């Protein structure tokens, strides 16, 4: 279900925002 | 150590949006 | 289907866990 | 749906690998 | 470094709970 | 920091395979 997917998008976007994040960090 | 300051921030706005993800789940 | 759900929000809590340890982490 | 599973195991490596890194890192 | 030490163990029990994930989903 | 390079390159790969994961979604 469409809702679902969105879930799973909204989801995945944490994950990218979260490596976003980490790599982020690392240069220091 | 700011850039320290402004990590734990960008980070916080992560947890945000992941509670966010959370309390849009619970309604289903 | 619920479980699904329920996996949704099973995955979502690693998330949460994942940046309470970041920024746990980031104190140091 | 098996496709939507999937997609969930798909995620949850990632996760897996987030994690993976992250203790990966620690070590430094 | 104990506090180092603690991390990994915190983040170790993180990807026990993604195994624990992983497993469960696999019986689908 | 070297280590730290190939730290950021493993980083990147994760990445890489979120991207590859959303794309692969937005078919949906």
Known sequence: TDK????LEKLAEIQKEIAEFLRELIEA
């Open 4 to 7: 679902i997917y969105d879930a």
